[PDB]
């Protein structure tokens, strides 16, 4: 059995250096050549480089030739990918994958690491209500938070039917915001209570918002 685990997600400012650890375990990791691949938030996949512990890290992409340095430490079987200096475009998810030889497909993958570069500070969100043919819409607007992500559930999780939580959108100020919505029959609009439980772990904030029309 072959596995690959990556380090925790990272938040930084443009300028510093950082590194991702990709550790391998299982029967016969020795033969596996590890490649790195980036997935920018909106776009798709793109191959950065490949390296074999034991150092034949010869292969890079021309697009990523001058940007980053990769490496490996055979002793602990991990493998790293390095950055001299970050920019705002470096915010992406990064995976390490394994193939058994030079010209082989990447059969086994890692969990992936999210990196965020912003020059912005961590701040707790602000929640606001979204109150109104028997299809009354409700919602919560979670505004101006950083960094990602937040977890929003409804009514303590009891209610699930018709709930939509949109992906975050990075705004002008460099902070995120998203909205959750649920449609309910008009007949329940005073009788039943609606509370959205947003959770933002980086700011350690837990907010419950009761939405009501008037």
């Amino acid at each position: 059995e072959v596995q690959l685990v990556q380090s925790g997600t990272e938040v930084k400012k443009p300028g510093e250096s950082l590194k991702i650890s990709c550790k391998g375990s299982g029967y016969g990791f020795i033969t596996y050549w590890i490649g790195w691949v980036r997935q920018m938030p909106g776009k798709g996949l793109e191959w950065m480089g490949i390296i074999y512990p034991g150092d034949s890290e010869t292969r890079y992409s021309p697009s990523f030739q001058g940007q980053v340095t990769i490496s490996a430490d055979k002793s602990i079987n991990t493998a790293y990918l390095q950055w001299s200096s970050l920019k705002a475009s470096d915010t992406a998810i990064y995976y390490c994958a394994g193939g058994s030889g030079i010209s082989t497909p990447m059969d086994v993958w890692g969990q992936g690491t999210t990196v965020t570069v912003s020059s912005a500070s961590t701040k707790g969100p602000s929640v606001f209500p979204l109150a109104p043919g028997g299809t009354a819409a409700l919602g919560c607007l979670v505004k101006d938070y950083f960094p990602e992500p937040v977890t929003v559930s409804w009514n303590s999780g009891a209610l699930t039917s018709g709930v939509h939580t949109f992906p975050a959108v990075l705004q002008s100020s460099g902070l995120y915001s998203l909205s959750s919505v649920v449609t309910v029959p008009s007949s329940s609009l005073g009788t039943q209570t609606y509370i959205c439980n947003v959770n933002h772990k980086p700011s350690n904030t837990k907010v419950d918002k009761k939405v009501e029309p008037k």
């Binding site: 996949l45 191959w47 010209s103 993958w109 969990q111 606001f128 979204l130 959108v169 919505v181």
Partner: protein, 218 residues
């Protein structure tokens, strides 16, 4: 470098019908000696690392069902699915492990075709707790519609607004195979109380005339 282009940017097919994806190469990925091509296919679903689905253009992996069959050789390759099921909605890539550096494909999202559905449009005025903060944000919501391609336009006193609203769409709903859209118009308090009426205008192929739903301030 060898560049690969997948044929359909967006591809929508009904349930149980076959789908077709193709890849093309400026060079050849076939080593004549062993007659084996060096092209793989991966699948990835939203919020999860990509999983390999085919190696050498025809060989599957341990978890890959017999419904997925690779094909082609040389410079045209085809990923064919015999019967599209609900769990197979994902984005597929094709890469080459022939000559380094290695390259991935553009991407091919697979929707589930369904009878065209009209959005349930709702309009939300900004909260009073947000006005005390200093900025107002009007929200326009589109609920349960197909296809995904729809567009909304903001009007303040029927003055066209642009570049001030940011959009956000959901993934294809697994149960009813539909989407939802939220457009957030962020504005300042002083400018919000300078005008009277606020309107969001929706256009979609599922509606004969553009639907506009709007609120008057107060």
């Amino acid at each position: 470098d060898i560049v690969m282009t997948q044929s359909p940017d967006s591809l929508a097919v009904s349930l149980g019908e076959r789908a077709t994806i193709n890849c093309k190469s400026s060079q050849s990925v076939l080593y004549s000696s062993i007659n084996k091509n060096y092209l793989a296919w991966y699948q990835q679903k939203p919020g999860q690392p990509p999983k390999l689905l085919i190696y050498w253009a025809s060989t599957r992996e341990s978890g890959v069902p017999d419904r997925f069959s690779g094909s082609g050789s040389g410079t045209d390759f085809t990923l064919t699915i015999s019967s599209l099921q609900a769990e197979d909605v994902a984005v597929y890539y094709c890469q080459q492990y022939y000559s380094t550096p290695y390259t991935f494909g553009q991407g091919t999202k697979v929707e589930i075709k369904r009878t065209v559905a009209a959005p349930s449009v709702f309009i939300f005025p900004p909260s009073d707790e947000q006005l005390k903060s200093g900025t107002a944000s009007v929200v326009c919501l589109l609920n349960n519609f197909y296809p995904r391609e729809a567009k909304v336009q903001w009007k303040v006193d029927n003055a066209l607004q642009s570049g001030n609203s940011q959009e956000s769409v959901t993934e294809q709903d697994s149960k009813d195979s539909t989407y939802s859209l939220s457009s957030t118009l962020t504005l300042s308090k002083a400018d919000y109380e300078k005008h009277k009426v606020y309107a969001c205008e929706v256009t979609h192929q599922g509606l004969s005339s553009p639907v506009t739903k709007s609120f008057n301030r107060g």
